[PDB]
Write a protein that binds this ligand. Structure first.
Ligand SMILES: CC(C)CCn1c(SCC(=O)Nc2ccccc2F)nc2nccnc2c1=O
Ligand SMILES: CC(C)CCn1c(SCC(=O)Nc2ccccc2F)nc2nccnc2c1=O
Lengths: 5, 125, 125, 5
């Protein structure tokens, strides 16, 4: 996996 | 919202699972006929990848057809390679198939594929 | 073949176009009912993202249903957030919705979402 | 974009 898009 | 988190591999995982549904013939809803060959697929994947299929399956009469016949000049192997690309992101481009793949991509309105074919042809050349 | 080239953005572009078909209500083939709320979707996208929907739409009787009613304990906002995640890879996870999102993801059998929810809850604590 | 996967 999860990221800040 | 602007506060979302994103799972990087999600789109790739969805596409892999759509290709597994195609392999298993699950929920396929159209047969594409290319001369003597038939290919089963999902209309939504075709519409998401090809300008020609988007036009066909948004037409009020053709959206209901379970069989679509392509132009007899289309090469079945070229179509198979582009259908595999739609479902996997991988294009099996070879010296022996590039002209057929490029012509098929022009007909299906798949500009990125047409562009890479043109580049590979120009490099040889 | 092992000689393929790959278009990096393809899977993301397919998913964006599937979400545009959902927005335009093109080729949607099922309504999911969550208490008083209805959500239109494509069965193949649901099956590609959720173990519960894969089981439902591979069942020889339920594969033909045009309406599926979820358990009344499922929160409609939680379902909406997970349906948006299926079609975009982005999860709108907030303090005010995390318990409902986690419970909905457990029911839909979406383990990656359950895992991130558990991690965000553990961090607060 | 195109790459060798
Ligand atoms: C970016 C591009 C190279 C993708 C391939 N592609 C496509 S993909 C079909 C498409 O656009 N689907 C679609 C559109 C709106 C909403 C939902 C949808 F599923 N269409 C075309 N149309 C005319 C000319 N060229 C193209 C072309 O190259
Ligand atoms: C990797 C995982 C976290 C994806 C989400 N996912 C899924 S996605 C549904 C799925 O697997 N679809 C599918 C399978 C084979 C062929 C074509 C298909 F479309 N199913 C589950 N099933 C049981 C338990 N957990 C999961 C779970 O987490």
């Amino acid at each position: 996996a999860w990221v800040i898009p | 919202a602007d506060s979302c988190i994103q799972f990087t591999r999600h789109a790739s995982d969805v596409l892999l699972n759509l290709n597994r549904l195609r392999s298993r013939d699950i929920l396929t809803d159209v047969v594409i006929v290319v001369s003597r060959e038939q290919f089963r697929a999902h209309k939504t994947v075709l519409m998401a990848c090809s300008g020609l299929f988007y036009s066909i399956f948004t037409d009020q009469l053709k959206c209901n057809l379970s069989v679509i016949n392509l132009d007899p000049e289309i090469n079945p192997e070229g179509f198979c390679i582009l259908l595999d690309f739609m479902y996997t992101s991988r294009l099996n481009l070879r010296e022996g198939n590039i002209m057929a793949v490029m012509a098929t991509a022009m007909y299906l309105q798949m500009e990125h594929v047409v562009d890479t074919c043109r580049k590979f042809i120009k490099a040889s050349e």
